[PDB]
Every structure is written in C-alpha cells, then in structure tokens.
Amino acid sequence: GFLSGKRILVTGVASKLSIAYGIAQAMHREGAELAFTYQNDKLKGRVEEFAAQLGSDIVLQCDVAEDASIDTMFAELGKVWPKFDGFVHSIGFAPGDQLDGDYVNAVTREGFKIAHDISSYSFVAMAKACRSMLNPGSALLTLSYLGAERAIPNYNVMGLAKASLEANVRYMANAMGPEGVRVNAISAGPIRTLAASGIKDFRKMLAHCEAVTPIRRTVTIEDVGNSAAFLCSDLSAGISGEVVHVDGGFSIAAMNE
Amino acid sequence: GFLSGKRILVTGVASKLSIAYGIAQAMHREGAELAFTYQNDKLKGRVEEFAAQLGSDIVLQCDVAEDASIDTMFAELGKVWPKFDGFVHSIGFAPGDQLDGDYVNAVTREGFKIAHDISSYSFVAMAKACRSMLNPGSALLTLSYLGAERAIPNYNVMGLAKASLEANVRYMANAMGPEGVRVNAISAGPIRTLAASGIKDFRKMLAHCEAVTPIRRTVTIEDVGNSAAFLCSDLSAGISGEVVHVDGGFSIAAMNE
Amino acid sequence: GFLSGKRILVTGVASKLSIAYGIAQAMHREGAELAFTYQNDKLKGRVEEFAAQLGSDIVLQCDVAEDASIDTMFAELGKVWPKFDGFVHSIGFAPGDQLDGDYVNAVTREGFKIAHDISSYSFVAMAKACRSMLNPGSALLTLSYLGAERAIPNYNVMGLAKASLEANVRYMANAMGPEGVRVNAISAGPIRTLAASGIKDFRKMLAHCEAVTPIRRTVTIEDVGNSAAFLCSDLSAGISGEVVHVDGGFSIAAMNE
Amino acid sequence: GFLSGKRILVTGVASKLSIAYGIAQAMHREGAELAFTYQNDKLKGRVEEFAAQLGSDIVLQCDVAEDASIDTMFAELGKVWPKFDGFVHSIGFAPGDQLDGDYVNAVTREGFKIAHDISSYSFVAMAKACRSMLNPGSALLTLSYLGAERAIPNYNVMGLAKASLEANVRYMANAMGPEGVRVNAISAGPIRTLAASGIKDFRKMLAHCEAVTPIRRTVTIEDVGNSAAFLCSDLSAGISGEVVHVDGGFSIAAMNE
Numbered sequence A, B, C, D: 001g002f003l004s005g006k007r008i009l010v011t012g013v014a015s016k017l018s019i020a021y022g023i024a025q026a027m028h029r030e031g032a033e034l035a036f037t038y039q040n041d042k043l044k045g046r047v048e049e050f051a052a053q054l055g056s057d058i059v060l061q062c063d064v065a066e067d068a069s070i071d072t073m074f075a076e077l078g079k080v081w082p083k084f085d086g087f088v089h090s091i092g093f094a095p096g097d098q099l100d101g102d103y104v105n106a107v108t109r110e111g112f113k114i115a116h117d118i119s120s121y122s123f124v125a126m127a128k129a130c131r132s133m134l135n136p137g138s139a140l141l142t143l144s145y146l147g148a149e150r151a152i153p154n155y156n157v158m159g160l161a162k163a164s165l166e167a168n169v170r171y172m173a174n175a176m177g178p179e180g181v182r183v184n185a186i187s188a189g190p191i192r193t194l195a196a197s198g199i200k201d202f203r204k205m206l207a208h209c210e211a212v213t214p215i216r217r218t219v220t221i222e223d224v225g226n227s228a229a230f231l232c233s234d235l236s237a238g239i240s241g242e243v244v245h246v247d248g249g250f251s252i253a254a255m256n257e
C-alpha cells in the first residue's frame, strides 16, 4: 500500500474504539510495519493482542509523564528499529474534575499542569527522544480537537492543552522540517471511544453534530485512520505544520440549526 | 489504487507543468478513470494527447465563462458517464494589468469581475451543472493560494478571487454534503508553471520560499497531485469544506529570515 | 472626543436602524465632522434629515455601481473637503433570489456578479477615487459578517461576497498603509435593520444567538458604532488589515447548546 | 474620558518601557482609577513611584506563581476596592534556556511547565480569585504575540504558552460572559522592553518588521495602550473572546520582501 516500507510507532491504543486503533489498522492495511507502546500494566496484554493481530511484536511500555520512561522506550525500540519513519501520538489527559462544568470554576493550577504536560508536552518530548532515530521523509502525527480553536462547554482546560498542542505542531514542524521531518495534526470530530464517559452530555453532542455536520454523520475512527495513514505517507510530502480537520465539515458551517 | 472505480473529471490541463497535469497523473496512478476538458482550440490537441497517455479518450471543450459551454460539456460527458464521482477544478484567471503592482491602483471594476467569475464562480457553476450526475461519495476539489488569507504583493485582486473561492468551498460543502458530496481545496505553494510568467519577481519568490519553508523546498505538482488524489478518494471521507495547505509549512512559520 | 478634528464620510444611512446610523451617531458624539451620501432620490430627503441632526449638510448622492457616480460624488465633496480622514463603507447587496435556500441552487452567475461588485469591489472603488484626498492618519472602515468565514444557511452568495470583501481589506491595507492609511473591517453580529426582512427566519436566528452568545445578547448598532468610531480614530493607530469581531463572542464559542 | 468611573487593576509594570506602563498611562488619561501590583521587592518602590504619578496608592505585591500570593493580594485590594471593573494581565515568563535556538532541542519539561503556568494559567488564576469582586460590565485583558499562531524562531515554548493563553481567553470569555464579564487579548507587534535582551537578534527583527509592516513602523506602547484602554471600556461592549492584533498589519501581509 502507500505505507509499504514505513516503520511507524503507534501510541495510544487502549481498545478497539480507540482512535489509535483505527489508525493502526489503516496503516497496517497500506503496508506499514508497526510498533506499539502501552501506558501501564492494565493495558499491556490488550495492546500485545492487537499488535499481534497487526503482525507486530514490538510492544513497549511508555508513560509520557516520565522522561525516563520515554528514553527507555526509545532505547528498546532501537534494538530492533535503529531508525524508523515517525510515530502517531494518540495520548491525552486531564484530571476528572477538570472537564465538568464552568471552566473558570473547574480549572485549577495542577489540573492545568497535568492537562498540558500529558496532552501537549508529551508530543515534543517523544520527538525530542527519537530525533536521531528518525529517517528523512519521516512524519509525526498527533490528534487534536476543535476545542483548541473555539470554546466548547465542559472541554475546559483541554481546549487550552490542545491549543498548546497545535502550536507545538507548528514549532516542531519548523525545527524538524530541515532534516526531513514533517509534523501534522488531525482535528477529529467527536467519536464514541473510552474518552466519551468523562465528558458531560456526550451522546447528546453526537446527535447534534450529526444533524448539523455537512456530511450529516459523525466521523469514524476508520475515517480518521485513513487520513492519518495519508498524513504519515510520502503522499503528503508537501504538508507540514498542518492541522487537518477530519470532522465532516462541522467546523466550517454555522447556525445549521 | 485508492481511486480504482472512481470516474473523475479533470479541468485545467494546459501543459506538463500544469498542476492539473500532476494531479491527473497521480489520480491515474491510483486507478481512477479520467475525463478531461480543454478551454479552446489552442489547447485541444495537447489535452487530447495527455488524455490518451492516461488511457482516457473523453476530451471535451469547456470555457467556464459560458454557462452554455458548461451545460453542453456536461451533456456530452453524460453520454458516456451518466454518473461520475466528482471533478478537479484547476482554473483561474485575471487580466494582465491586474497582477502588476499597487493593488489599489491596479484593480478595476472589470478586472475584479473577470477575476471572480472565472476564478471563483466557475467552481460552483460546474457543480451546479452536474449536481444530478454526481454519485454519492463524490468529491469536488479546487486549488487556491495563500493570497486568499494574506496580502501578497502583486497577487492583488486574485487574492480576493481566491478568498471568494475558499468561501465557495464552504457553502458548497454545506449544501452538497447531505447528498454524498464533499468539496475541498488545496492551498498550494508557488510552483513554476505557465502562471509564473504573469507574476512579478517569480523566480525570486521561489528562492525566498525554499529558504524559509519548513521542508526547505517548494512543493511539486507531484506533491499536489498526491494530496489531490487523496482528497478525491474515500480515504478522506471525513474531510469536507477544508482548505488543506500543501505548501511545505510556509504558511505556519513567521520571520524565518 | 477621540474623533475631534476628523472629517469622516459615512456611507449607507438608510434608516434609524441602519448600522450606518449607529456609527454616525457615535462618531458625531466623539467630535468628528461628518459628510454623508445616499444611494438615490428615494433616500435623498431622509439622509438629509439625519445629516442635519448630526450637524452636517454634506449629503451627496452615490451609487457604487457606477464608477462615474463615485467620481462625481468625490468631486462635490472635494469642493468642501479638499482633504478628509476616511470613510465608512456600510453597503451590501445581492438580488433577492440569491438569499433563500440551497446555495448551490440559488446562486446564479449574475447574482454572484452583482453580489461581489456591490458588496466587495465598491469598497476599493471608493478608495481608488479619493486616495489622493486622504490625509495621513486616515482610516477606512467596512462591515463584514461571520458568513465570510463559515457557511451559514441562506446567506449563500453573500458569504462569498464578504469573504472577498475581507480579503479586500487586507490588500487595501497593505497597499495604502505606506502612505498613512489604515483599512479595517468590523464583523458584526446579526442586528435588526432593513437586511432583516430579506433573510430566511431572521427572528429565529436572533433568538438563537442571544441564547448562545457569551454576552448573552445580540449586539446593538450602538455597540458597533463605538467599535467603528474607535477603528477610525487615532486610538487604533496600531491596527490595520484587521477584521474585528463585534458579535458578543458568538463566533469563538461552539456547541453552547 | 471613556474610562471615567472604572477601577482597573494593572499588572506587570516593570519599567517606563513596559507595555503595562503604556497601558496604565492611557487608561489613566481616559479617567480610570488604577491599582497596581508588583512581582517582588526589587520592583516595590519603582511601581510605587509610577502608581503615584498615575494618582494611585494601591500598590499590592503579587507573584502569580503562588495561588496564595494571588489570594492575599485580592484580599488587600478588597479592603479598598470591594468591587472593581477588570484587570490587565501583562505577565509572561519562560526560563532563559528555553528561548534560544532549535525549539526541539531547547524545550524541556520544566521549561514548558514554567512557561505555561506563568504565561497562561495565571491569567485564569487571577480571574478565579476575583470573580466575585468583579462588577457587571467588567473587562479582562491580556497581551499575546503572533508566536501563538505562527512558528517564530527562538520564541520556542513561549509560542505554545501564548497559544494556550489565547485559548484561555476564549474559555474564560464563554464562562464569564453570562455574568457581565468580557475577556480579550491584544496580539502586539514587537516592542523594545525588558523582553528585548532575552530573545535572539531582536534588533534585526524590529528592523525587518518596520520594513514589512503595512504601516511601515513598529507599534508603540502608546498604540497598544490605547487599544488596551478601549478594550477595557464600555466602548468595546460588543467584543469578547477576541485577540485583536495591534501589529501595524504585520501578520496580514506576506512576502512584502
């Protein structure tokens, strides 16, 4: 496929509903060789199962909150992939209290710190740690949400973390471009995944979106997966520092009441 | 390839340097069945030659300035493609006097009229005329330039025509989405094509861009072609109403002096 | 006031509800010397009355559809105001048929032509015609709508006209800046004026906005009037080429129910 | 003046060059009653002097890094100003090592942490702490930089901090709007202040901008001061959640040589 010969690292797989799952499948469909990472013991065997379904057996632990974890992960990957062609960063976090209700009243200094560190810093942290191992022609992908551009009720500090993330896409795209590395983001529409629970009135949101979205349907991880496969293939060599909205046109329309 | 089974109409092929040429090749590479249109007698045989190189023999005349031309073209296409899956609109025009020097002093009411009619209206005009012939899952693609978003010296009224074009992408994406049609645009970086002559200090521009562009190189029609192939394939079903910048990151950086 | 000693030309006063009326009141309050134009005889006397109230007896006719009309109006204005400090462009138009329903089915070549000529070009037409009469430190102002940036139902081709006008603002600003002229636009929230009748379900829209606008209320021509007076005074010297949104925050929020 | 009867809290006055100084002068001129804070003792006396000149003797200490510091400062302020009308957040910070060179190599976890806490969170921290002391019709203001939207060399992690801060503005605005509070930011062009020394080749940058900025000159703290005074007065009632660029048009133009 259009990814044949590419060795890509996919983070964030937690379940079959995971966006990183849809991406991994698609990337695997187009012929990329995948490696995976899991956050903790809770997820290890699951990811190991999915990795094996995708012909991969490179499943390493990684908690983006620990510089040492990252470093150690990239050290284990090297042993088998001395050089690779990028990675998908499908990670994100904010303490529970954070995404519920009035942003000003919900936000706290420590939640703000955690939301940013895990959701925005982690991206560069990982690039930082594997810079040397990247082959020219490499692509780094990340996922964001409209909440970075607009104020979405309950999204709260995550909006700020995403804004921070998108800017991180630009600065990393500018600094790494000279050595063959592109860096982009997909601003996906809401999808029903593990992240759904945490957010207030989700199932209600997904119904409103479907009715007001140009394509009249919410996007699927399949959809996202295909756009991610493309963004990590040479087919997109002219795109770098870009936040591609894969939301069925939701963001460009207004008052589709 | 990822376009196999798609019947796409490609407008704008004038020469091997043409952006629509790079797109046609790529689309042909991924297995789409192409049909072409030519503006006048001057271009007919050329396009006919390229069409034949791409296994196509559907070469129809079309001058987007004539509603009747458009209608007649779509009538001839129907005879062979009763239903198709979209079209690439690689057309654009502005009288010579228009793109030279001080915008305020250069712009005139008639140049403004022509620049918009050909560069922005034509897009919807064509969708208008083939709406019925479009298969659900159809994608319409158009090409724009950064001049729509920023003020570029000498680009002058074309900036306004492009702004108009991009907005046209949104409104058409919103109205057609409900019936299976997506509409997008590629905001490409400057490429040396027939359009180069018309613009002041081009070769100088292309050198400045290469030095300040994240990927440190200007994009190629190959680059654009691949992004267009993707935007017209089901791989991008989640993207609609989007202006994807295929400019190597030029637009997201600043003062890369 | 902050406009003391400024002679500003106010276009578009049609009624006491008109955005041009609110802006005139405001600049008048702030100490600017005003001059007004009217489209035709049907509005001659009225505008003459309003001008009177605002202490002005410079009420010149002007139909922006005629370069000749513009040229002659600036001729008459010169007789009294050899040099002035800017003008407010509060004109917009699109044939009735264009504004209701499916954009793709409503939009027609002439409609698109008329929409962009009156709503977008006229702004520069006027700049062209008085460029030499403008004092250093002048400011030109125009009114846009979020329809330029997003796809709003029924706004149809007017969305493209405004997108084109907003880009007109950036080109004009970059062109005239070096000679002491700033050009800006105000993207106003929906207001109840003569534009009310001609747009499908306005009342429903003005109730939705209020509900969802951060300031929980639609803006008033007073509100816009004050941002307008500020954008044409030296208080906004550092601002040019900008589209300041005066919509109570409407556009920055998303899914506020 | 247009700020008569407003009690505004001005943060960040470090020197006569400080953007906070220009803004204070401006609001003072317009008739607002001011209160000031200083980061530490090194700046106690100075700020006390400036405040004096501006007819104010409310000079409270505040280190935005301590929720405790903020809480106590609003305690003291309450004693005299039980209810006030807004505050100017003119604070920014990132450890020296973060700002020079390749962003990817310069950025470090703590740097990123410190950058976002001081430059982005503090804005909301302060809102949180005085939310109940704010009068209806209040306005909060912050200063951003184009670095949030584009990738500027050496701005590095500060680009992400500002991106995060700009999104803070939209969330805060959507949250506090319903209670009579507007929140806006000013994206100012480069100015010569205490931020000058710490950024690589500032002088070269301030000469480039002047050359390429539509108004052909860098903005002054006076310029910003006036946009600031306007954004915190009732003249901007219809404006909230907005990032008004006060950069002489710099960001709207492209390739102006």
Ligand SMILES: NC(=O)c1ccc[n+]([C@@H]2O[C@H](COP(=O)([O-])OP(=O)(O)OC[C@H]3O[C@@H](n4cnc5c(N)ncnc54)[C@H](O)[C@@H]3O)[C@@H](O)[C@H]2O)c1
Binding pocket: A011, A012, A013, A014, A015, A017, A018, A019, A020, A038, A039, A043, A062, A063, A064, A065, A089, A090, A091, A092, A093, A118, A143, A144, A145, A187, A188, A189, A190, A191, A192, A193, A194, A195
């Ligand atoms: N699904 C949606 O509706 C949606 C929409 C738009 C954007 N997003 C974004 O897509 C990404 C993936 O979300 P999803 O819906 O697939 O979520 P998911 O809940 O399935 O997985 C999130 C991943 O985050 C990982 N993670 C959290 N902390 C980590 C850390 N400390 N170290 C390593 N891994 C860590 C988890 O292991 C998890 O697998 C996020 O950036 C999210 O914001 C999701």
Ligand SMILES: NC(=O)c1ccc[n+]([C@@H]2O[C@H](COP(=O)([O-])OP(=O)(O)OC[C@H]3O[C@@H](n4cnc5c(N)ncnc54)[C@H](O)[C@@H]3O)[C@@H](O)[C@H]2O)c1
Binding pocket: B011, B012, B013, B014, B015, B017, B018, B019, B020, B038, B039, B043, B062, B063, B064, B065, B089, B090, B091, B092, B093, B118, B143, B144, B145, B187, B188, B189, B190, B191, B192, B193, B194, B195
């Ligand atoms: N090449 C560049 O540097 C560049 C960069 C960005 C955007 N663009 C855009 O890409 C498109 C294609 O440009 P290109 O560089 O490949 O140009 P090109 O000069 O090779 O071809 C332009 C096409 O416009 C067509 N055209 C003009 N008037 C027409 C009409 N009346 N009816 C039918 N066809 C008509 C011509 O036949 C021509 O083939 C345009 O929209 C252009 O703005 C070009």
Ligand SMILES: NC(=O)c1ccc[n+]([C@@H]2O[C@H](COP(=O)([O-])OP(=O)(O)OC[C@H]3O[C@@H](n4cnc5c(N)ncnc54)[C@H](O)[C@@H]3O)[C@@H](O)[C@H]2O)c1
Binding pocket: C011, C012, C013, C014, C015, C017, C018, C019, C020, C038, C039, C062, C063, C064, C065, C089, C090, C091, C092, C093, C118, C143, C144, C145, C146, C187, C188, C189, C190, C191, C192, C193, C194, C195, C196
């Ligand atoms: N009403 C709103 O909520 C809204 C929202 C955002 C922006 N605006 C814009 O502000 C502007 C002011 O419109 P308005 O709502 O004040 O309504 P209005 O009916 O008062 O003003 C529109 C003006 O354009 C004038 N005009 C039209 N064609 C003319 C021509 N050929 N030459 C000269 N004058 C002509 C009309 O006489 C009229 O005075 C419009 O451009 C509108 O798009 C309106």
Ligand SMILES: NC(=O)c1ccc[n+]([C@@H]2O[C@H](COP(=O)([O-])OP(=O)(O)OC[C@H]3O[C@@H](n4cnc5c(N)ncnc54)[C@H](O)[C@@H]3O)[C@@H](O)[C@H]2O)c1
Binding pocket: D011, D012, D013, D014, D015, D017, D018, D019, D020, D038, D039, D062, D063, D064, D065, D089, D090, D091, D092, D093, D118, D143, D144, D145, D146, D187, D188, D189, D190, D191, D192, D193, D194, D195, D196
């Ligand atoms: N100088 C420019 O051209 C530029 C451009 C755009 C925006 N801005 C922004 O405007 C703001 C004002 O900066 P400035 O240029 O006026 O320089 P400055 O040196 O006058 O002000 C920065 C202020 O932040 C204060 N500060 C930092 N950490 C503190 C903390 N822990 N708690 C409380 N106060 C602390 C500093 O004392 C100082 O007064 C900054 O946020 C800056 O990013 C500056």
Ligand SMILES: Cc1ccc(Cn2cnc(-c3cccs3)c2)cc1
Binding pocket: A092, A093, A094, A095, A096, A145, A158, A189, A190, A191, A194, A195, A196, A198, A199
């Ligand atoms: C608690 C938590 C778990 C997982 C996430 C990931 N996430 C980020 N954004 C989102 C959402 C986008 C749309 C609706 S929820 C989810 C965020 C918070």
Ligand SMILES: Cc1ccc(Cn2cnc(-c3cccs3)c2)cc1
Binding pocket: B092, B093, B094, B095, B096, B145, B158, B189, B190, B191, B194, B195, B196, B198, B199
């Ligand atoms: C005269 C003319 C011929 C062809 C075009 C097409 N065109 C549109 N934009 C461009 C350019 C983008 C970058 C540099 S020139 C070319 C425009 C004008």
Ligand SMILES: Cc1ccc(Cn2cnc(-c3cccs3)c2)cc1
Binding pocket: C092, C093, C094, C095, C096, C099, C145, C158, C189, C190, C191, C195, C196, C198, C199, C202
């Ligand atoms: C048919 C027509 C005539 C005049 C206008 C002027 N106009 C521009 N924008 C608007 C409106 C925006 C929001 C509500 S009305 C009105 C628009 C359409």
Ligand SMILES: Cc1ccc(Cn2cnc(-c3cccs3)c2)cc1
Binding pocket: D092, D093, D094, D095, D096, D099, D145, D158, D189, D190, D191, D195, D196, D198, D199, D202
């Ligand atoms: C190290 C550091 C300390 C303080 C700042 C404050 N700051 C923010 N933005 C700026 C500047 C933008 C343009 C020129 S200086 C300075 C930035 C970096």
